[PDB]
């Protein structure tokens, strides 16, 4: 059982995102998830230090665990604490 979500890249206006299936049945830990997102979202420009934070789609809060993710929502991955407010969808 897993939640289908979509992960965007902070500040990237044209990157359509990557759908993920996420839960403890898919990843050993939140850190495991961030490390796979680092590999799959890596681009030497917008993610200069990989994925270290995950924001909700409006930047209202950071996601801190897999359980806080909700089926069918979208999320934004950042190298740092600075949420870029662009039209991801």
């Amino acid at each position, epitope marked *: 059982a897993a939640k289908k979500v979509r992960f965007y890249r902070n*500040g990237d*206006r*044209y990157f359509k995102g990557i759908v993920y299936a996420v839960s403890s049945d898919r990843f050993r830990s939140f850190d495991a998830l961030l490390a796979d997102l680092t590999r799959s979202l890596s*681009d*030497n420009i*917008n993610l200069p230090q990989g994925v270290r934070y995950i924001y909700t789609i409006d930047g209202s809060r950071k996601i801190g665990s897999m359980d806080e993710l909700e089926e069918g929502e979208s999320y934004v991955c950042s190298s*740092d604490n*600075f949420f870029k*407010k*662009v039209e991801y969808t």
Partner: antibody, heavy 115, light 108 residues
Framework: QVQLQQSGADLVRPGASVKLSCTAS????????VHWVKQRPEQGLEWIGRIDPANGATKYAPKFQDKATLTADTSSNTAYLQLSSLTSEDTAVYYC????????WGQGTTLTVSS | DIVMTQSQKLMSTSVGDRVSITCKAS??????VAWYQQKPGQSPKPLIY???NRHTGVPDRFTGSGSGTDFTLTINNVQSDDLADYFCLQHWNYPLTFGAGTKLELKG
């Protein structure tokens, strides 16, 4: 719409410094990244560097790290390209550009370095 | 320092023709490539993003294709308004690098 508005043509003597500016309307530069590029008739387009106005983070091309300094004020929605110790090779048109995609360009600034 | 090679400095064409402009990257760059049109005295106009996507306002006759190292801007049904300079750009890594430019002239 989305607009990038660069400062006027400038003529400065060699060895001096000059400040080129790029003012955004239609979006907030806090939410984006501003790039700069140099164009000469024969060398083509050369990327200068990039700034993230949200934290100040800058990235420069190898040829420009000593010569160029990128700054930005989110308050004025304005990005700045400072060029120091100007030589004859800095005579060029400079553009600012919205993001690594360059999906919006400034109109350009013709800089003439000359005594 | 990746090199974007536009081996055609000058391409001659006729109104109505199809013209294909190449750009070869010196190492794999996925689809992080863009294309731009520039006319004398004007800033570049964005045409293509992520190798194959038309920017808004770009007419149907422009198509971008390729991935890896080999990229092509295709102009079908060439118009006089399309006689201009075209360059590619990679933003797969720093520094971002442009091709040297392909000039599209009229064949006389």
């Amino acid at each position: 719409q989305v607009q990038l508005q660069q400062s006027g043509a400038d003529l400065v003597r060699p060895g001096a410094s000059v400040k080129l500016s790029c003012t955004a309307s239609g979006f907030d530069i806090k939410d984006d990244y501003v790039h700069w590029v140099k164009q000469r008739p024969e060398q083509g387009l050369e990327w200068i560097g990039r700034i993230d106005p949200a934290n100040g983070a800058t990235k420069y091309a190898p040829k420009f790290q000593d010569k160029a300094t990128l700054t930005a004020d989110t308050s004025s929605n304005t990005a700045y390209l400072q060029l120091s110790s100007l030589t004859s090779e800095d005579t060029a048109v400079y553009y600012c550009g919205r993001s690594k995609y360059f999906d919006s360009w400034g109109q350009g600034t013709t800089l003439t370095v000359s005594s | 320092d990746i090199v974007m090679t536009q081996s055609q400095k000058l391409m001659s064409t006729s109104v109505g023709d199809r013209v294909s402009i190449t750009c070869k990257a010196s190492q794999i760059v996925d689809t992080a490539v863009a294309w731009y049109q520039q006319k004398p005295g004007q800033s570049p106009k964005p045409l293509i993003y992520l190798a194959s996507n038309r920017h808004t306002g770009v007419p149907d006759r422009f198509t971008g294709s390729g991935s890896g190292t080999d990229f092509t801007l295709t102009i079908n049904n060439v118009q006089s308004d399309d006689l201009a300079d075209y360059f590619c750009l990679q933003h797969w890594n720093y520094p971002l690098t442009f091709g040297a430019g392909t000039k599209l002239e009229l064949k006389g």
